[PDB]
């Protein structure tokens, strides 16, 4: 559904 790019912090 969504890309997590390098260096991209992600909080589900």
């Amino acid at each position, epitope marked *: 559904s969504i*890309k*997590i790019r*390098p260096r991209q912090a*992600f909080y589900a």
Partner: antibody
Amino acid sequence: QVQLQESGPGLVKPSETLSLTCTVSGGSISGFHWSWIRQPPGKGLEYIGYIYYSGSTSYNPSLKSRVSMSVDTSRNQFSLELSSVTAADTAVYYCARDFGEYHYDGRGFQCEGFDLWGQGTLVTVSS
Amino acid sequence: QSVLTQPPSVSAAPGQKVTISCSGSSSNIGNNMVSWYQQHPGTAPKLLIYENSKRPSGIPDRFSGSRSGTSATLGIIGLQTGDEAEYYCATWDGSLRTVFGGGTKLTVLS
């Protein structure tokens, strides 16, 4: 500016447990998935598993009966425990930060690559 | 054989260009995007390409990546001696793990 550093025993006796830690500095565990990858001398790369900052994990099926990972967001560290080791586990172990695709169904995080790597630490399984 | 397959070695003279294949299947490249690594022996792999075709900062434009079907390709133009290294492709596989190709040794013919 984020740096990763492995810490490990060097030598481990066969049948015993290998424990490694990775320290993240100049950044934080928060908001990322983190992995261990290993490489026996002269051989290819093998992904071991990932752990999210909140503690959820996924492990390589080839290692499921022996491996676990944990995270200490307070110390900005995460760890590996690999049980019942043999010479097949002799390898340089790297910690790394992950990226990929996140699904809001059962799939969750699909790890497609590793952008930041530690320098790696050699673990030799031997008497 | 491993899930992702690469030719064991590729070579060309300095200044020439090369490609490196990454052979996958519907369970990996078919569904997920490919990343590539350069590894000089004794040091950690370095990310060269992600999301099939994108370069991180610091990676020169003579490195490129593409994906088609269930395969992927790394391209290197303007070969320099310093490019000699082991190159790996990787992505997620439906067996629920990240998988790497077996690696391709690039030799710059001297």
